[PDB]
């Protein structure tokens, strides 16, 4: 989710993909860790005993022979990690998220409270303030005439610079804000 | 007065209490949970009187306490059944939910 | 080797299913660039304007206006008499309401006749 | 009843005589001290009407209209407020003027002994709806909703006064007494079917019938605040309660009649509440649900019940105030975010707990939540509709369900989920909009607690 | 909007859409609150004859247990007092039928 | 302060109830109605004083 | 109503045997309890379906509330393919687990017994469709089915858990709930079923094998 | 109460805990048998079960196969 | 209460313990800073087994894309800390 | 108590059966409602006669209101408005005063199936035969009349009946 | 069960129906029967609000048991005895009944068998 995708992925992205996908799920099917421990290195040695095709005609049909074969033999219900896409905890604290420019609109009387965090909270407005112009020249400057190719961007060269487009992904609320 | 009814209506309406009080400066503290589960236990151990009553003598009531609107022949009335399923089913709920809110405070501490 | 999948409207192919993917061109290729081009050049000038400081209110999509407008106020300008539509409009408003007035009309005949020879058990029906 | 109507003519000229920054509280508190002082005609009879003079009477039917046109007028100068600030002094008097000349018309027709005075009001409700829609509305279409409006309406009432006057001619009286007293029935002809329809599709056109509706999300979309509030409130239930005064004098021809309007009412229900569930826009969502509710009201007119007329008066009541709440609801988002669109401003529940609180109370009461009155209303009306054939129970039941889909639709879709980043300017809730949703919403579950003020003269 | 890719960092993403992006006609239905239409694991029309022929099976099954019932092997169960005509919607001026029980 | 809980908060509910129920509810009639006690053979009425006979010699199937 | 009942309770005890969330296992077993009580109502036997339900609370309730404890203790963890031994580790939820799944099915002078055991013997021993009778058989079969399930893959075996323990259930809250629904668990079928009047005509007559059928398929 | 991580170790145990749930499981088990002793029946069935074909001709009343 | 106050130490030490646990990469020649493919010699399939290792290890997934760059230790504990908003 | 007539409202002479312990162990039912009646049904009984106290010291009384008899509507001619006026008002309220017997009916009904137990299919015949015979007489006045009734489409409907009545009398006497 | 085996997969016409039974007159194949006989009066039963389906001939037991269970409140343990004459009376009623249906049953296998018997005589 922190990197700039490609515009596609290569032969080995896929085949590594599909060793990730295969081992998960066959993990999935094998609950116990000695199993497992067996299956994963019996996988881990069909996998590899193709590693040396120069031919790559024949990689990607043995590629595709072993998406069908993954597709046919998958887990129904496998294994999710709570936190991620298909977990049972996987967006139960975004009700807990706030933006930060809420604090904006706090009423003096709950600004009263807090003096200390909200000064260091108007030294790093100005920051931001202060750096914006030179993110936007630099972004500028390097970027080609017709445009960006990708969505990947440049870091800070300068001696005092910030890297562009900092203030989002610096400032996010928090994994667990409440 | 047969205190039967008196107890079975007393057993709802405690229940309510801390709906009202949800208002005050009690909702805002920690220890609005523990009031809840108190009132419920205490609902609890009230509500127990009329099961025995029923468990000696069978006794069972109706109370058409509040006459809310009257069509021309249906008159539509405040109305509870005390029978054996109530009084049966309402002190399990209670002891159920007393127990449920005790494991809540543990559960949903971090909420 | 194994059982075949078969995809549906409601059940799609899967990317790693699709033999699109696995016979690919350099014309392939430049088009993957091109469309990563477009989106690179959409996302740099979304985020210009979400990290601006002086940025107070809401950024202001042509995408949705045109969802909206299209969904909305774009339909009767496209509009044209053609036999499908014909069909399809006096189908999905005619039908129906002639199908509940036979229904309804039988149903309540039915109802008199059965109450003008007094056999209906009417008994204790005040309330109507 | 002049204790009542001569304080809005005195509404008037305070209003043009106030001070530039004091027409707001003028009008607000005094409409609220006349509104305290409709209050009184609740105390009604059981058997007759209360028949002040010989121009103007007071029905168990027409009371609690009254009543709430006469809340709703300080409800609508509360909402009104906000988006006219920098507008002149002038233009602002003009507003409060247009909004007073239609709350004094509203309260003229439902008291109205006569049916020729009766139309002449509900015609002349439409000249301050059309100016406040067509010049204090926000797009550009708002020209074409106003033509929408009018000719959509004129067009069904102007057979009406054709058949009115001719009614005049052949008993002599059109007055409501006389017409109830000396009826006759209805023979089977054609010239007595025309009579029928023209009595009858002016009231259709207005509740509106579904097929005669496409004027209503036109000119409840694009109007300000206020005219939506007293579009979707009170002038919807004009032609309900015109309805069932008519309904006198067209028996026994309404059997055979009414299946048509029977059909297209329940059909029509159907599709409707099945539109709301693929809708944009927030407005023509609440549009349509009030199409949906209209159309239960004219089923109920329609069957010719004492069960079925509580249950149309109940539902009115209730989806006035239900409707007027949510569309104050929708403008607040709207006044933030200057947009209609339903999917962007999301997360609304995280920036604005209480008036989540507020959206949750009108969803639920527009998906009829016993034992509000909205549940009262419709309940009765499903009986009568069982009663008049058991098959209803079918179409009933479905928009029992489709209904409850988009309202609670309606919620998830605005406040839950995460909030929109780029969306920065998301103020706290101001205290005249909490104030305008606690007025609102309390008097509904007062009613709730004594129902048969608003049960009409069935009861 | 389901079989978006979730690992993605989209500019709205609950909905899974990026800014400036066209918006598919039928967003609305597919906003993943709504119908969805990912790949399953078992091939459609192949979960509809299983799912169609387990419902049709117990249909047919339970009619049939329906007129091959299961009993015991006894006799009606008898009451006294002519099996309770009085109690059964009292009627107490017909003088009915008798009905009378034997030891066995 | 120990014992204010069970006074505000049961003591209280159950006057109000009590008073509510014996001095208007029951002023009204078929507002509380209590099924029959049950009546036995061998039984004796409080207010009547009637006794009720035994049952019929039974056969004794010791 | 009967076939309904049958029906439903078959078909949720069949989904249950092959879940892996311990919450989707609890829940098609309460929705195959609510066929039973629905098969129960449908031979004309309402006070033993009220009696059912009074008896499912309470262990019902306490499963949920072990579930949830053994969800805290392992980092909101609801997949039995992660959960290894717990019987050592969590000792009370331990117990309480397994005194939950015995009442459920139905063992003797549990809760659950007087009410299942007696709601079998009168499906058995009623003139009733027999394909109801068949499935609420294979339903009662199926529910010890899951309840091993249940208690194999979450405590027995070893850990399958990430490496940071943090198993706690010390804590007086947890304990003194679980203990008091356990205490109810334990005794109050046959406080209830002795405290309460005859609505119902006892079956006193019944051939052996029948008598057991409950118990030999609860062990098959 | 201070229970720490172990970080793949077996966790902490206080001796209450322990306690309880034998205690808990011992009483269940001893309930379990105390009213099997006492009310066997319950499991076992009371009165015995007839079987039919062990019943005379005219205890049933039916003629010799000859009227 | 929950887990503890988890910190950078922390993760860096439950990183390289799960790193010398592997059979195949010896545990004195292994430091933070060294590159999974110079240094300790392995291939791609190698790598996605140390990340499905570490997903184990502190019970969370990472995308395969992100999983692809990190190539020493380092990169690994600070991928870690900056997705748990470690700062201490 | 006195508070309403007890012919209208009728009840059983109640019988009900004297205590009769057969265990040493005490009742805790007898033991609880000696505590409910010490501690709430004496101060209850206090309060109350503090406020009848004070109710007895202002005693005033209302009174229920006499309606004559006005002719009906069959004494009416055809466009007479006010005897028809006076007509109708009649008739309304002898429809209210019928709606409420109907009511006093269901009441003894619904009382009667409460009241008697599992014993009510038995012992209620004679209410349920009431409430037969006032539902027949409702229903034959008022029923079908629909919404905009009046007392001239009641009168239409009772010649309707007597028309019917009177062909099918005179018919069955000529078989 | 074996009744439904033998009725289903047996011949219909010897087994009998539960629904229709008897159908043989209830004095056909025994000289003289006693009238079997009531303990509890109607009355009684009335009072006591047993039930519709528990004033069967076992209803002065349950009254019994009834009056036992109420006198003795606290002790719920005291009933043992009432209770199971209750159980026994019902007991020796469910048995009757299976005397019953296995009379209607060799009844019926009697009849048709004599019948046919008596017509294979008659068609010779
Ligand atoms: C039944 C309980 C009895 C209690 C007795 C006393 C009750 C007095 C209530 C007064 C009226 C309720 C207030 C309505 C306006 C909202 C006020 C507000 O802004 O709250 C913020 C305020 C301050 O909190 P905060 O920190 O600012 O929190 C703001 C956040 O947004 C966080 O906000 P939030 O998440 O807390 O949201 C508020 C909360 C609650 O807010 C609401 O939703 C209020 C509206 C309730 C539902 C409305 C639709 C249904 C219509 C029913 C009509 C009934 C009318 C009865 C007469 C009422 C007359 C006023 O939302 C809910 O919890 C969901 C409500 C679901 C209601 C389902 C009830 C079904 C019917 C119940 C039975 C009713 C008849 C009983 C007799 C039956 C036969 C025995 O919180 C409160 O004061 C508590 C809210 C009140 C909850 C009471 C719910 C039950 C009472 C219903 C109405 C009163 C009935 C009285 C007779 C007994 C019934
Ligand atoms: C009697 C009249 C009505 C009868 C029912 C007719 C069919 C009604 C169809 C309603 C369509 C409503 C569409 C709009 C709702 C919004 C769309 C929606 O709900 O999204 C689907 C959403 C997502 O699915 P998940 O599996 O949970 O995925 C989550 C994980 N990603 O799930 C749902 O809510 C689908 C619910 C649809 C149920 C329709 C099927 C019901 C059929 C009932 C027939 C059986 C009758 C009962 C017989 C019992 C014996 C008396
Ligand atoms: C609060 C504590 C106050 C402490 C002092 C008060 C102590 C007792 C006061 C007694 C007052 C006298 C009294 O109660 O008389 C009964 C008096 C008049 O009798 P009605 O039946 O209403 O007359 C018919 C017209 N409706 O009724 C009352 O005013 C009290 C009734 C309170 C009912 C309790 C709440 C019921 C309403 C809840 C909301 C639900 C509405 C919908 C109901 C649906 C029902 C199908
Ligand atoms: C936005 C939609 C609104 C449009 C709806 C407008 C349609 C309203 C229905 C038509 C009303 C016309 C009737 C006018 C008043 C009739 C009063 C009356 O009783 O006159 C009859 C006569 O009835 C008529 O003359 C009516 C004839 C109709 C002429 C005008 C036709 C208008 C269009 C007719 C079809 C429209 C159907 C309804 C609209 C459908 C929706 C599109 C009796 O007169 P006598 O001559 O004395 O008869 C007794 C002695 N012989
Ligand atoms: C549990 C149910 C599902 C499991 C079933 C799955 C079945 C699939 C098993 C068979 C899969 C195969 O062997 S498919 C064999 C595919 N053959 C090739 O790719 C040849 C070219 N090799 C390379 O490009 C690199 O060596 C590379 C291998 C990418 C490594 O890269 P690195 O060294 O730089 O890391």
């Given at each position: 989710?922190?990197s700039?995708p490609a515009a596609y992925l290569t032969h080995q992205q896929k085949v590594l993909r599909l060793y990730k996908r295969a081992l998960r799920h066959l993990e999935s099917w094998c609950?116990?860790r000695d199993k497992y421990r067996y299956f994963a290195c019996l996988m881990r040695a069909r996998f590899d005993e193709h590693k040396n095709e120069k031919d790559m005609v024949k990689a990607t049909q043995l590629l595709r022979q072993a998406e069908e074969e993954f597709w046919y033999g998958q887990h129904?219900?496998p294994?999710?990690?709570?936190?991620?896409?298909?977990?049972?905890?996987?967006?139960?604290?975004?009700?807990?998220?706030?933006?930060?420019?809420?604090?904006?609109?706090?009423?003096?009387?709950?600004?009263?409270?807090?003096?200390?965090?909200?000064?260091?909270?108007?030294?790093?407005?100005?920051?931001?303030?202060?750096?914006?112009?030179?993110?936007?020249?630099?972004?500028?400057?390097?970027?080609?005439?017709?445009?960006?190719?990708?969505?990947?961007?440049?870091?800070?060269?300068?001696?005092?610079?910030?890297?562009?487009?900092?203030?989002?992904?610096?400032?996010?609320?928090?994994?667990?804000?409440? | 007065?047969?205190?039967?009814?008196?107890?079975?209506?007393?057993?709802?309406?405690?229940?309510?209490?801390?709906?009202?009080?949800?208002?005050?400066?009690?909702?805002?503290?920690?220890?609005?949970?523990?009031?809840?589960?108190?009132?419920?236990?205490?609902?609890?151990?009230?509500?127990?009187?009329?099961?025995?009553?029923?468990?000696?003598?069978?006794?069972?009531?109706?109370?058409?306490?509040?006459?809310?609107?009257?069509?021309?022949?249906?008159?539509?009335?405040?109305?509870?059944?005390?029978?054996?399923?109530?009084?049966?089913?309402?002190?399990?709920?209670?002891?159920?939910?007393?127990?449920?809110?005790?494991?809540?405070?543990?559960?949903?501490?971090?909420? | 080797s194994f059982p075949k999948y078969?995809?549906?409207?409601?059940?799609?192919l899967p990317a790693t299913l699709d033999p699109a993917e696995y016979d690919i061109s350099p014309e392939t290729r430049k088009?993957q660039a091109?469309?990563?081009?477009?989106?690179?050049?959409?996302?740099?000038?979304?985020?210009?304007?979400?990290?601006?400081?002086?940025?107070?209110?809401?950024?202001?999509?042509?995408?949705?206006?045109?969802?909206?407008?299209?969904?909305?106020?774009?339909?009767?300008?496209?509009?044209?008499?053609?036999?499908?539509?014909?069909?399809?409009?006096?189908?999905?408003?005619?039908?129906?309401?002639?199908?509940?007035?036979?229904?309804?009309?039988?149903?309540?005949?039915?109802?008199?006749?059965?109450?003008?020879?007094?056999?209906?058990?009417?008994?204790?029906?005040?309330?109507? | 009843?002049?204790?009542?109507?001569?304080?809005?003519?005195?509404?008037?000229?305070?209003?043009?005589?106030?001070?530039?920054?004091?027409?707001?509280?003028?009008?607000?508190?005094?409409?609220?001290?006349?509104?305290?002082?409709?209050?009184?005609?609740?105390?009604?009879?059981?058997?007759?009407?209360?028949?002040?003079?010989?121009?103007?009477?007071?029905?168990?039917?027409?009371?609690?209209?009254?009543?709430?046109?006469?809340?709703?007028?300080?409800?609508?100068?509360?909402?009104?407020?906000?988006?006219?600030?920098?507008?002149?002094?002038?233009?602002?008097?003009?507003?409060?003027?247009?909004?007073?000349?239609?709350?004094?018309?509203?309260?003229?027709?439902?008291?109205?002994?006569?049916?020729?005075?009766?139309?002449?009001?509900?015609?002349?409700?439409?000249?301050?709806?059309?100016?406040?829609?067509?010049?204090?509305?926000?797009?550009?279409?708002?020209?074409?909703?106003?033509?929408?409006?009018?000719?959509?309406?004129?067009?069904?009432?102007?057979?009406?006064?054709?058949?009115?006057?001719?009614?005049?001619?052949?008993?002599?009286?059109?007055?409501?007494?006389?017409?109830?007293?000396?009826?006759?029935?209805?023979?089977?002809?054609?010239?007595?079917?025309?009579?029928?329809?023209?009595?009858?599709?002016?009231?259709?056109?207005?509740?509106?019938?579904?097929?005669?509706?496409?004027?209503?999300?036109?000119?409840?979309?694009?109007?300000?605040?206020?005219?939506?509030?007293?579009?979707?409130?009170?002038?919807?239930?004009?032609?309900?309660?015109?309805?069932?005064?008519?309904?006198?004098?067209?028996?026994?021809?309404?059997?055979?009649?009414?299946?048509?309007?029977?059909?297209?009412?329940?059909?029509?229900?159907?599709?409707?509440?099945?539109?709301?569930?693929?809708?944009?826009?927030?407005?023509?969502?609440?549009?349509?649900?009030?199409?949906?509710?209209?159309?239960?009201?004219?089923?109920?007119?329609?069957?010719?019940?004492?069960?079925?007329?509580?249950?149309?008066?109940?539902?009115?009541?209730?989806?006035?105030?239900?409707?007027?709440?949510?569309?104050?609801?929708?403008?607040?988002?709207?006044?933030?975010?200057?947009?209609?669109?339903?999917?962007?401003?999301?997360?609304?529940?995280?920036?604005?707990?209480?008036?989540?609180?507020?959206?949750?109370?009108?969803?639920?009461?527009?998906?009829?939540?016993?034992?509000?009155?909205?549940?009262?209303?419709?309940?009765?009306?499903?009986?009568?509709?069982?009663?008049?054939?058991?098959?209803?129970?079918?179409?009933?039941?479905?928009?029992?369900?489709?209904?409850?889909?988009?309202?609670?639709?309606?919620?998830?879709?605005?406040?839950?989920?995460?909030?929109?980043?780029?969306?920065?300017?998301?103020?706290?809730?101001?205290?005249?909009?909490?104030?305008?949703?606690?007025?609102?919403?309390?008097?509904?579950?007062?009613?709730?607690?004594?129902?048969?003020?608003?049960?009409?003269?069935?009861? | 909007?389901?079989?978006?890719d979730?690992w993605?960092?989209?500019?709205?993403?609950?909905?899974?859409?990026?800014?400036?992006?066209?918006?598919?006609?039928?967003?609305?239905?597919?906003?993943?609150?709504?119908?969805?239409?990912?790949?399953?694991?078992?091939?459609?029309?192949?979960?509809?004859?299983?799912?169609?022929?387990?419902?049709?099976?117990?249909?047919?099954?339970?009619?049939?247990?329906?007129?091959?019932?299961?009993?015991?092997?006894?006799?009606?169960?008898?009451?006294?007092?002519?099996?309770?005509?009085?109690?059964?919607?009292?009627?107490?001026?017909?003088?009915?039928?008798?009905?009378?029980?034997?030891?066995? | 302060?120990?014992?204010?809980?069970?006074?505000?908060?049961?003591?209280?509910?159950?006057?109000?109830?009590?008073?509510?129920?014996?001095?208007?509810?029951?002023?009204?009639?078929?507002?509380?109605?209590?099924?029959?006690?049950?009546?036995?053979?061998?039984?004796?009425?409080?207010?009547?004083?009637?006794?009720?006979?035994?049952?019929?010699?039974?056969?004794?199937?010791? | 109503?009967?076939?309904?009942?049958?029906?439903?309770?078959?078909?949720?005890?069949?989904?249950?045997?092959?879940?892996?969330?311990?919450?989707?296992?609890?829940?098609?077993?309460?929705?195959?309890?609510?066929?039973?009580?629905?098969?129960?109502?449908?031979?004309?036997?309402?006070?033993?379906?009220?009696?059912?339900?009074?008896?499912?609370?309470?262990?019902?309730?306490?499963?949920?509330?072990?579930?949830?404890?053994?969800?805290?203790?392992?980092?909101?963890?609801?997949?039995?393919?992660?959960?290894?031994?717990?019987?050592?580790?969590?000792?009370?939820?331990?117990?309480?687990?397994?005194?939950?799944?015995?009442?459920?099915?139905?063992?003797?002078?549990?809760?659950?017994?007087?009410?299942?055991?007696?709601?079998?013997?009168?499906?058995?021993?009623?003139?009733?469709?027999?394909?109801?009778?068949?499935?609420?058989?294979?339903?009662?079969?199926?529910?010890?089915?899951?309840?091993?399930?249940?208690?194999?893959?979450?405590?027995?075996?070893?850990?399958?858990?990430?490496?940071?323990?943090?198993?706690?259930?010390?804590?007086?809250?947890?304990?003194?709930?679980?203990?008091?629904?356990?205490?109810?668990?334990?005794?109050?079928?046959?406080?209830?079923?002795?405290?309460?009047?005859?609505?119902?005509?006892?079956?006193?007559?019944?051939?052996?094998?029948?008598?057991?059928?409950?118990?030999?398929?609860?062990?098959? | 109460?201070?229970?720490?991580?172990?970080?793949?170790?077996?966790?902490?145990?206080?001796?209450?805990?322990?306690?309880?749930?034998?205690?808990?499981?011992?009483?269940?088990?001893?309930?379990?048998?105390?009213?099997?002793?006492?009310?066997?029946?319950?499991?076992?069935?009371?009165?015995?079960?007839?079987?039919?074909?062990?019943?005379?001709?005219?205890?049933?009343?039916?003629?010799?196969?000859?009227? | 209460?929950?887990?503890?106050?988890?910190?950078?130490?922390?993760?860096?030490?439950?990183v390289?313990?799960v790193l010398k646990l592997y059979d195949k990469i010896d545990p004195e020649k292994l430091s933070?800073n060294s590159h999974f493919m110079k240094d300790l010699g392995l291939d791609s399939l190698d790598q996605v087994e140390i990340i499905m290792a570490m997903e184990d290890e502190?019970?969370?997934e990472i995308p395969d894309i992100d999983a692809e760059k990190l190539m020493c230790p380092q990169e690994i504990?600070?991928y870690?800390?900056?997705?748990?908003?470690?700062?201490? | 108590?006195?508070?309403?007539?007890?012919?209208?409202?009728?009840?059983?002479?109640?019988?009900?059966?004297?205590?009769?312990?057969?265990?040493?162990?005490?009742?805790?039912?007898?033991?609880?409602?000696?505590?409910?009646?010490?501690?709430?049904?004496?101060?209850?009984?206090?309060?109350?006669?503090?406020?009848?106290?004070?109710?007895?010291?202002?005693?005033?009384?209302?009174?229920?209101?006499?309606?004559?008899?006005?002719?009906?509507?069959?004494?009416?001619?055809?466009?007479?408005?006010?005897?028809?006026?006076?007509?109708?008002?009649?008739?309304?309220?002898?429809?209210?005063?019928?709606?409420?017997?109907?009511?006093?009916?269901?009441?003894?009904?619904?009382?009667?199936?409460?009241?008697?137990?599992?014993?009510?299919?038995?012992?209620?015949?004679?209410?349920?035969?009431?409430?037969?015979?006032?539902?027949?007489?409702?229903?034959?006045?008022?029923?079908?009349?629909?919404?905009?009734?009046?007392?001239?489409?009641?009168?239409?409907?009772?010649?309707?009946?007597?028309?019917?009545?009177?062909?099918?009398?005179?018919?069955?006497?000529?078989? | 069960?074996?009744?439904?085996?033998?009725?289903?997969?047996?011949?219909?016409?010897?087994?009998?129906?539960?629904?229709?039974?008897?159908?043989?007159?209830?004095?056909?194949?025994?000289?003289?029967?006693?009238?079997?006989?009531?303990?509890?009066?109607?009355?009684?039963?009335?009072?006591?609000?047993?039930?519709?389906?528990?004033?069967?001939?076992?209803?002065?037991?349950?009254?019994?048991?009834?009056?036992?269970?109420?006198?003795?409140?606290?002790?719920?343990?005291?009933?043992?005895?009432?209770?199971?004459?209750?159980?026994?009376?019902?007991?020796?009623?469910?048995?009757?009944?299976?005397?019953?249906?296995?009379?209607?049953?060799?009844?019926?296998?009697?009849?048709?068998?004599?019948?046919?018997?008596?017509?294979?005589?008659?068609?010779?």
């Amino acid at each position: 989710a922190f990197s700039a995708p490609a515009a596609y992925l290569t032969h080995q992205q896929k085949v590594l993909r599909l060793y990730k996908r295969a081992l998960r799920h066959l993990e999935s099917w094998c609950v116990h860790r000695d199993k497992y421990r067996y299956f994963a290195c019996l996988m881990r040695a069909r996998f590899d005993e193709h590693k040396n095709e120069k031919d790559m005609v024949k990689a990607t049909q043995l590629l595709r022979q072993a998406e069908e074969e993954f597709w046919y033999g998958q887990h129904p219900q496998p294994y999710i990690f709570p936190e991620s896409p298909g977990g049972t905890s996987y967006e139960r604290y975004e009700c807990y998220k706030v933006p930060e420019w809420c604090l904006d609109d706090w009423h003096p009387s709950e600004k009263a409270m807090y003096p200390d965090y909200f000064a260091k909270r108007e030294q790093w407005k100005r920051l931001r303030r202060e750096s914006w112009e030179r993110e936007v020249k630099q972004l500028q400057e390097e970027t080609p005439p017709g445009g960006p190719r990708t969505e990947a961007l440049p870091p800070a060269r300068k001696e005092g610079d910030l890297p562009p487009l900092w203030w989002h992904i610096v400032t996010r609320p928090r994994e667990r804000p409440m | 007065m047969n205190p039967f009814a008196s107890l079975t209506l007393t057993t709802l309406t405690i229940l309510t209490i801390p709906i009202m009080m949800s208002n005050s400066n009690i909702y805002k503290t920690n220890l609005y949970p523990n009031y809840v589960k108190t009132t419920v236990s205490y609902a609890f151990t009230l509500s127990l009187v009329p099961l025995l009553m029923f468990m000696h003598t069978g006794q069972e009531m109706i109370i058409s306490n509040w006459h809310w609107m009257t069509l021309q022949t249906v008159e539509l009335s405040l109305s509870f059944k005390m029978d054996y399923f109530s009084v049966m089913f309402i002190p399990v709920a209670l002891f159920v939910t007393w127990s449920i809110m005790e494991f809540s405070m543990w559960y949903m501490h971090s909420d | 080797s194994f059982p075949k999948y078969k995809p549906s409207r409601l059940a799609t192919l899967p990317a790693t299913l699709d033999p699109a993917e696995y016979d690919i061109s350099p014309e392939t290729r430049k088009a993957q660039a091109e469309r990563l081009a477009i989106r690179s050049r959409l996302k740099r000038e979304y985020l210009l304007q979400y990290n601006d400081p002086n940025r107070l209110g809401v950024i202001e999509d042509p995408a949705l206006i045109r969802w909206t407008y299209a969904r909305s106020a774009n339909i009767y300008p496209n509009f044209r008499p053609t036999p499908k539509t014909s069909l399809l409009g006096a189908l999905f408003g005619i039908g129906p309401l002639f199908f509940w007035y036979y229904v309804f009309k039988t149903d309540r005949d039915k109802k008199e006749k059965l109450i003008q020879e007094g056999k209906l058990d009417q008994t204790f029906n005040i309330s109507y | 009843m002049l204790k009542i109507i001569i304080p809005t003519t005195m509404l008037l000229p305070m209003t043009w005589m106030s001070k530039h920054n004091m027409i707001w509280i003028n009008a607000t508190v005094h409409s609220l001290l006349i509104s305290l002082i409709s209050l009184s005609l609740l105390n009604q009879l059981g058997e007759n009407s209360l028949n002040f003079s010989l121009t103007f009477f007071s029905d168990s039917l027409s009371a609690p209209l009254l009543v709430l046109t006469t809340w709703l007028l300080p409800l609508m100068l509360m909402a009104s407020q906000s988006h006219l600030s920098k507008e002149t002094t002038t233009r602002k008097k003009l507003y409060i003027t247009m909004l007073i000349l239609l709350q004094l018309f509203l309260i003229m027709t439902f008291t109205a002994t006569e049916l020729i005075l009766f139309y002449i009001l509900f015609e002349a409700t439409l000249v301050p709806t059309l100016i406040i829609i067509t010049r204090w509305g926000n797009q550009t279409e708002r020209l074409n909703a106003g033509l929408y409006f009018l000719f959509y309406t004129l067009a069904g009432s102007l057979p009406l006064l054709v058949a009115l006057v001719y009614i005049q001619n052949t008993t002599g009286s059109l007055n409501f007494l006389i017409i109830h007293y000396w009826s006759h029935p209805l023979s089977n002809s054609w010239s007595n079917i025309f009579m029928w329809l023209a009595c009858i599709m002016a009231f259709m056109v207005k509740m509106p019938l579904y097929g005669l509706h496409l004027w209503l999300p036109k000119a409840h979309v694009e109007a300000p605040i206020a005219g939506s509030m007293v579009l979707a409130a009170v002038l919807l239930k004009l032609g309900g309660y015109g309805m069932m005064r008519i309904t006198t004098i067209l028996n026994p021809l309404t059997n055979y009649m009414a299946y048509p309007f029977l059909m297209l009412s329940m059909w029509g229900m159907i599709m409707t509440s099945s539109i709301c569930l693929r809708q944009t826009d927030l407005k023509s969502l609440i549009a349509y649900s009030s199409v949906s509710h209209m159309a239960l009201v004219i089923v109920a007119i329609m069957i010719q019940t004492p069960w079925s007329f509580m249950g149309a008066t109940a539902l009115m009541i209730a989806h006035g105030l239900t409707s007027s709440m949510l569309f104050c609801l929708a403008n607040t988002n709207y006044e933030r975010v200057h947009s209609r669109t339903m999917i962007l401003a999301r997360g609304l529940q995280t920036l604005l707990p209480l008036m989540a609180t507020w959206w949750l109370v009108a969803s639920l009461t527009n998906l009829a939540l016993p034992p509000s009155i909205n549940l009262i209303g419709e309940l009765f009306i499903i009986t009568a509709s069982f009663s008049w054939s058991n098959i209803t129970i079918i179409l009933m039941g479905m928009n029992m369900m489709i209904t409850a889909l988009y309202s609670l639709y309606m919620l998830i879709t605005t406040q839950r989920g995460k909030y929109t980043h780029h969306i920065n300017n998301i103020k706290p809730s101001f205290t005249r909009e909490n104030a305008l949703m606690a007025l609102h919403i309390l008097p509904l579950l007062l009613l709730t607690l004594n129902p048969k003020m608003i049960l009409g003269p069935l009861y | 909007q389901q079989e978006r890719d979730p690992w993605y960092d989209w500019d709205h993403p609950d909905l899974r859409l990026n800014w400036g992006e066209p918006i598919h006609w039928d967003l609305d239905m597919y906003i993943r609150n709504r119908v969805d239409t990912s790949p399953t694991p078992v091939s459609w029309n192949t979960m509809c004859k299983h799912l169609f022929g387990f419902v049709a099976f117990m249909l047919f099954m339970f009619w049939v247990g329906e007129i091959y019932p299961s009993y015991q092997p006894v006799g009606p169960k008898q009451y006294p007092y002519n099996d309770l005509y009085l109690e059964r919607g009292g009627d107490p001026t017909k003088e009915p039928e008798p009905v009378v029980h034997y030891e066995i | 302060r120990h014992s204010i809980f069970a006074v505000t908060h049961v003591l209280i509910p159950v006057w109000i109830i009590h008073y509510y129920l014996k001095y208007h509810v029951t002023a009204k009639p078929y507002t509380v109605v209590e099924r029959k006690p049950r009546i036995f053979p061998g039984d004796t009425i409080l207010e009547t004083g009637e006794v009720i006979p035994l049952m019929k010699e039974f056969p004794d199937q010791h | 109503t009967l076939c309904l009942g049958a029906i439903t309770t078959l078909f949720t005890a069949l989904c249950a045997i092959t879940q892996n969330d311990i919450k989707k296992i609890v829940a098609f077993s309460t929705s195959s309890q609510l066929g039973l009580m629905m098969v129960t109502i449908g031979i004309n036997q309402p006070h033993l379906a009220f009696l059912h339900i009074c008896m499912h609370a309470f262990f019902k309730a306490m499963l949920f509330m072990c579930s949830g404890s053994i969800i805290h203790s392992l980092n909101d963890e609801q997949d039995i393919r992660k959960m290894g031994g717990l019987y050592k580790a969590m000792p009370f939820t331990t117990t309480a687990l397994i005194i939950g799944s015995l009442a459920l099915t139905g063992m003797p002078y549990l809760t659950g017994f007087y009410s299942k055991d007696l709601i079998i013997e009168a499906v058995n021993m009623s003139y009733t469709n027999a394909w109801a009778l068949l499935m609420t058989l294979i339903a009662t079969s199926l529910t010890a089915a899951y309840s091993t399930r249940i208690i194999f893959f979450a405590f027995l075996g070893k850990p399958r858990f990430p490496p940071l323990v943090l198993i706690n259930e010390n804590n007086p809250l947890l304990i003194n709930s679980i203990k008091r629904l356990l205490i109810g668990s334990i005794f109050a079928g046959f406080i209830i079923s002795n405290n309460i009047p005859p609505m119902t005509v006892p079956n006193t007559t019944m051939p052996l094998y029948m008598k057991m059928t409950a118990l030999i398929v609860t062990i098959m | 109460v201070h229970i720490e991580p172990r970080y793949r170790q077996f966790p902490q145990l206080t001796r209450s805990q322990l306690i309880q749930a034998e205690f808990f499981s011992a009483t269940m088990w001893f309930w379990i048998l105390w009213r099997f002793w006492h009310d066997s029946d319950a499991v076992l069935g009371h009165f015995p079960y007839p079987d039919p074909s062990q019943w005379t001709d005219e205890e049933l009343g039916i003629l010799p196969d000859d009227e | 209460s929950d887990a503890p106050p988890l910190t950078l130490e922390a993760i860096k030490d439950r990183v390289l313990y799960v790193l010398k646990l592997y059979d195949k990469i010896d545990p004195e020649k292994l430091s933070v800073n060294s590159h999974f493919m110079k240094d300790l010699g392995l291939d791609s399939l190698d790598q996605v087994e140390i990340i499905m290792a570490m997903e184990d290890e502190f019970g969370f997934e990472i995308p395969d894309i992100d999983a692809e760059k990190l190539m020493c230790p380092q990169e690994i504990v600070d991928y870690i800390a900056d997705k748990k908003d470690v700062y201490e | 108590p006195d508070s309403w007539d007890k012919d209208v409202y009728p009840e059983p002479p109640r019988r009900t059966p004297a205590p009769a312990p057969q265990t040493s162990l005490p009742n805790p039912v007898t033991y609880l409602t000696k505590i409910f009646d010490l501690l709430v049904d004496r101060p209850v009984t206090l309060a109350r006669e503090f406020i009848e106290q004070q109710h007895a010291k202002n005693r005033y009384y209302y009174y229920h209101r006499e309606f004559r008899r006005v002719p009906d509507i069959t004494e009416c001619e055809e466009k007479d408005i006010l005897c028809m006026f006076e007509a109708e008002m009649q008739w309304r309220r002898d429809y209210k005063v019928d709606q409420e017997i109907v009511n006093i009916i269901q009441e003894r009904l619904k009382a009667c199936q409460q009241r008697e137990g599992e014993s009510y299919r038995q012992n209620c015949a004679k209410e349920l035969e009431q409430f037969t015979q006032v539902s027949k007489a409702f229903q034959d006045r008022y029923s079908d009349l629909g919404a905009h009734y009046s007392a001239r489409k009641c009168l239409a409907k009772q010649k309707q009946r007597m028309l019917a009545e009177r062909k099918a009398a005179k018919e069955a006497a000529a078989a | 069960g074996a009744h439904l085996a033998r009725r289903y997969l047996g011949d219909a016409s010897k087994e009998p129906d539960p629904l229709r039974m008897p159908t043989f007159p209830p004095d056909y194949g025994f000289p003289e029967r006693k009238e079997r006989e009531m303990v509890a009066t109607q009355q009684e039963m009335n009072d006591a609000q047993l039930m519709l389906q528990q004033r069967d001939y076992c209803a002065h037991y349950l009254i019994q048991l009834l009056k036992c269970k109420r006198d003795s409140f606290p002790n719920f343990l005291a009933c043992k005895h009432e209770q199971h004459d209750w159980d026994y009376c019902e007991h020796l009623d469910y048995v009757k009944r299976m005397k019953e249906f296995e009379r209607e049953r060799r009844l019926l296998q009697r009849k048709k068998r004599r019948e046919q018997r008596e017509a294979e005589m008659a068609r010779g």
